[PDB]
Design a protein around this ligand. Structure first.
Ligand SMILES: *[C@@H]1O[C@H](CO)[C@@H](O)[C@H](O)[C@H]1NC(C)=O
Ligand SMILES: *[C@@H]1O[C@H](CO)[C@@H](O)[C@H](O)[C@H]1NC(C)=O
Ligand SMILES: [Cu+2]
Ligand SMILES: [Cu+2]
Ligand SMILES: [Cu+2]
Ligand SMILES: [Cu+2]
Ligand SMILES: [Cu+2]
Ligand SMILES: [Cu+2]
Ligand SMILES: [Cu+2]
Ligand SMILES: [Cu+2]
Ligand SMILES: [Cu+2]
Ligand SMILES: [O-]
Ligand SMILES: [O-]
Lengths: 552, 552
């Protein structure tokens, strides 16, 4: 096991992801950030210096469990006080299992500004993958707005709310094209990009040699978009999802939601004298963004040899039945960990869009989360009972609530209480979607849990009932860290509370989390060790722990 | 009989149709143009002074037959030379029959710049309309872009073509809203408009008293948009179409393509305590323009009192079955003229989108029209045989043409020949639609005939074949001046060549006309009287009528 040490500085910089200049959050002058790669069992040490001028910053490592290091999860106001400008913090954690993971900002809307990058973990040294491939292609997907993140943030906190709107560009490994298309030759209504290939927004071309097999790693850190990935004329075999192996299956395209990572295998068994289109299109929302595009370049063909066909036409955004058909097919690889068969706690969380005091907010069982200035982990380790609400948040919603109609907003409150588990509890969480404030509208929401992987027991339509208990999959369910709820549907997940610390569980769409859509889960904090002083040095924790008497 | 004299000047002026300032082509300082209202049989005299600085102008009176006056049609290079800066021209014509008509620019792309308005002809003095209503409302629909007309024109003449795109705003009597919605109440994602009612872009509200019946006259002069008109909670009785009367029928909404006019009657039956939305949405093209909205305000309710329902959701743009369902119903009112049972001439016109010398053009039987600098009416009266191509244009296309494939463009050319008819021929025209340059695309095209009305004999899918004859409606076909071809279909029309002149027959979508999509018909030209000198004063007609010898 090696220690992988990184030394990084976060600073803003001018950059043009789609050849339109804006400011991006770079790490060591790079956008996207540097890739962390390690082997399972290695320690990763990142010393991060904050060089933003007035802003705090944190980095969350998505999918890493932080077992023994919950202070290193990178969630402002939950695991730590943010890092102040000019300060250096050490995140030191272990990577336990192989997978495609990534990292991102977890304070304000910092990840939409560009703070993200890949974190890949290979098998233990000497050990190999369950599947053979000759090469690897890594792809991080994100979306880009031309509006400032500070104007977006304020617009989302105003009465009337100013929605951020659909993204201007989809970014593939940080690059995309705006107001022109590299596929303009198939449609004269499109403007041709003039690009010699050297520009910041020039496509990241995938170069493959014929008759080989390639592992394509795909992760999504979109703030809003749900995307569909397809390569013209090539079958994808799904082999990994969220750092866990799935039972393999072929599909023509995959749907990927913010927070998910997949590894797909392809084989370059097609006509070797041509190049092929890679298309990443928007779904689950009425599209107003051009697809992200690049080429699968079979060497030695010039990359300027455009494909004979147009890019694959993206599946209709609202064919939720097609989407369920993909999603429901995901099962754990033969020989995976199977769930506990009985649960000790089952919690029901209704997802609504609400209007609390003029403001449009999202609520979970009528509580919109507002995070305190004291970090929950330090607050619970030093038993600071006034830092947040000690009263237990609701574990159920009313059986007379009608999920087919708008909220009344009669009892909708902002809050910051925490759900608490006993170390070793098996917990089921039934996520219930509902109609939003507009009539006859419900959307898809990706939910992500920190510090754990859970089994996805099932999905269904309408309101979950006792009649649905027997449909839950306890034989083969996949282990994941992100899961979707479909329009007016439910999703049931199970996990064991075996990881001392305070863990966020929230919709991974960034404006939704900003508007309150998430909860806080705490378990076994009595067993948490020493927290680094920098993670304690703010709020109520700095107040009790800094000894600064008066008259003494 | 009465002479209606108008003193008019056209000048560009600053104006903000959607509250974003640009320049608009106004008549006598107003946008839209002044309405003409006369009674059938009167004579309209318009003395137009061109107050543009470097540009010529012409005004076409849409749907007036120009019976006796072919020189007053207002088509530059067909009926007349354009009117020069500083000069006054007189358009004198008879309005023969009652109905909803309008006028517009017919030089370059001048109508998209705002040169258009209403021409309404009431029954002969003393007569009544065949139906009763207590009031009437006049609506003229058009569309609006934020880019300059002249930058658009250069974009459509460039290699590679820069397409104009979807309109920014749909205008209802010259007003519309951009980036905000007057119906933002129903959706948090929409921005509210901060309008007082006094602004240039504030909606023209429809004021009505309960329990009355009204005639809503609706005309379209859009450059591109096919629109769908609907009123919340109010069924429409269709009673007039293109100045003629149709067999009355009820509908919840009507489709209207560029160049058509309709009259619909409504009765204010609904609950008198509230207001209803009028919504005009985009169809036939993938929408990216918000609906044009206004209120049907039941007096004395406050106009600020929003309806209880959202606006009616426009039917899906691509549900062409629904469109055909509406279109195929229109039949002539009993008492109307029936067609000649036998025709003397049948012409087949294939509509293609092509690339001629790198330029994306539109062509009819492979000729893309480019108009000459000599007006066809002057050239033909004075028998100037070198002014245009005297070869008859193609009257049929190859029966082996695959209308499901992009054109090859092998023989597609630009030309300016004329189809000539004998004074009194019954002419049949089958307009055939086909696949465009993009694979699997065919669009709807509204075709308009000048100087005539025709009977719509029928519509069909695919390619026309002679075995299609038994479906043609020789019994009840409506009389119209504009008619659509649906994607991949044909439409057959019949008219009589009885009105001496040179008449344009083109697709009424302004960009397509700019790109060559139209033909020219001339009949009985040796029966034309004296043409105005200003209409002759350019090109070949000037050169040959100005006696200016040399040595002298
Ligand atoms: C993190 O790792 C560095 C480098 O080994 C070390 O100096 C530092 O004290 C560690 N801090 C924690 C909290 O483990
Ligand atoms: C048009 O009518 C006006 C008013 O009667 C007259 O002065 C003018 O000469 C007429 N011109 C033509 C071409 O008829
Ligand atoms: Cu994440
Ligand atoms: Cu995470
Ligand atoms: Cu759309
Ligand atoms: Cu969400
Ligand atoms: Cu998170
Ligand atoms: Cu017209
Ligand atoms: Cu006309
Ligand atoms: Cu057309
Ligand atoms: Cu015309
Ligand atoms: O995570
Ligand atoms: O006309």
């Amino acid at each position: 096991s090696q220690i992988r040490h990184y030394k990084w500085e976060v600073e803003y910089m001018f950059w043009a992801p789609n050849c339109n200049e804006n400011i991006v959050m770079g790490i060591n002058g790079q956008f996207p950030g540097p890739t962390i790669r390690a082997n399972a069992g290695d320690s990763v040490v990142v010393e991060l210096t904050n060089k933003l001028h007035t802003e705090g910053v944190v980095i969350h490592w998505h999918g890493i469990l932080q077992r023994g290091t919950p202070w290193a999860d990178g969630t402002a106001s939950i695991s730590q006080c943010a890092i102040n400008p000019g300060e250096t913090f050490f995140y030191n954690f272990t990577v336990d299992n192989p997978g495609t993971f990534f990292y991102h900002g977890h304070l304000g809307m910092q990840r939409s500004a560009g703070l993200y990058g890949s974190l890949i973990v290979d098998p233990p040294q000497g050990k190999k993958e369950p599947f053979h491939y000759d090469g690897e292609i890594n792809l991080l997907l994100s979306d880009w707005w031309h509006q400032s993140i500070h104007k977006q943030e304020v617009g989302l906190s105003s009465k009337p709310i100013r929605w951020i709107g659909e993204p201007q560009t989809i970014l593939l490994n940080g690059r995309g094209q705006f107001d022109c298309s590299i596929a303009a030759k198939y449609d004269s209504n499109l403007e041709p990009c003039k690009l010699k290939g050297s520009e910041s927004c020039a496509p990241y071309i995938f170069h493959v040699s014929p008759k080989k097999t390639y592992r394509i790693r795909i992760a999504s850190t979109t703030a809003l978009a749900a995307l569909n990935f397809a390569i013209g004329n090539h079958q994808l075999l799904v082999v990994e999802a969220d750092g866990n192996y799935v039972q393999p299956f072929y599909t023509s395209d995959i749907d990927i939601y913010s927070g998910e990572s997949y590894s797909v295998l392809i084989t370059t068994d097609q006509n070797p004298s041509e190049n092929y289109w890679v298309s990443v299109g928007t779904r689950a929302r009425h599209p107003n963004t051009p697809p992200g595009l690049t080429l699968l370049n079979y060497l030695p063909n010039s990359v300027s040899k455009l494909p004979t066909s147009p890019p694959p036409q993206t599946p209709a955004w609202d064919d939720f039945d097609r989407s369920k058909n993909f999603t429901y097919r995901i099962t754990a690889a033969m020989g995976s960990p199977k769930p506990p068969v009985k649960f000790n706690r089952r919690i029901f969380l209704l997802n609504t869009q609400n209007v609390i005091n003029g403001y449009v907010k999202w609520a979970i069982n009528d509580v919109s989360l507002a995070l305190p200035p004291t970090p929950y982990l330090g607050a619970m380790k030093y038993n600071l009972l006034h830092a947040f609400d000690q009263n237990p948040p609701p574990e159920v919603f009313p059986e007379d609530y009608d999920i087919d109609t708008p909220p009344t907003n009669e009892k909708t409150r902002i809050g910051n209480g925490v759900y608490q588990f006993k170390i070793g509890e098996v917990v089921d969480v039934i996520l219930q979607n509902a109609n939003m404030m507009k009539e006859n509208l419900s959307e898809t929401h990706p939910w992500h849990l920190h510090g754990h992987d859970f089994w996805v027991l099932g999905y269904g339509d309408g309101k979950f009932s006792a009649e649905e208990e027997s449909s839950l999959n306890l034989k083969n369910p996949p282990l994941r860290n992100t899961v979707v709820i479909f329009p007016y549907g439910w999703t049931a997940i199970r996990f064991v509370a075996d990881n001392p610390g305070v863990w966020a569980f929230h919709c991974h769409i960034e404006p939704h989390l900003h508007m309150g859509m998430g909860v806080v889960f705490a378990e076994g904090v009595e067993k948490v060790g020493r927290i680094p002083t920098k993670a304690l040095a703010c709020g109520g924790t700095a107040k009790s722990l800094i000894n600064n008497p008066k008259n003494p």
